[PDB]
Structure 1
């Protein structure tokens, strides 16, 4: 989407590995706040949104 419009996925009822994203050469940034990208696999959440 355009930055005025920005879509929002809700992620729920599922399992994920975040290290697959954190070790990818694809990304120009990965800046994290209130959690560390190394820790996400050890930890979990009620909803996640993208």
Structure 2
């Protein structure tokens, strides 16, 4: 678990990249993500089958 805060959570370089396969947001939308402000974002990275 890594805490991300006090920065700009840009996603243009994230969504536009085609190197990813599946990317779904069940609570928000990428279009309105830019105009949305977050307090703290935690990134949990793991490798699974």
TM over 0.5: yes
**Count of residues in correspondence between the two structures:** 43
TM-score (norm 1): 0.74
For structure 2, list consecutive stretches of 5 or more residues without a partner in the other structure: 44-49
Quick check: 1:19–1:38 contact (8 Å CA) kept in 2?
no
TM-score (norm 2): 0.75
Computed over aligned residues only, the root mean square deviation of the Cα atoms, in angstroms, reads: 1.0
Structure 1 runs (4+) greater than 4 angstroms displaced: none
Larger RCO, structure (CA 8 Å, separation 6 or more):
2
For structure 1, list consecutive stretches of 5 or more residues without a partner in the other structure: 1-7
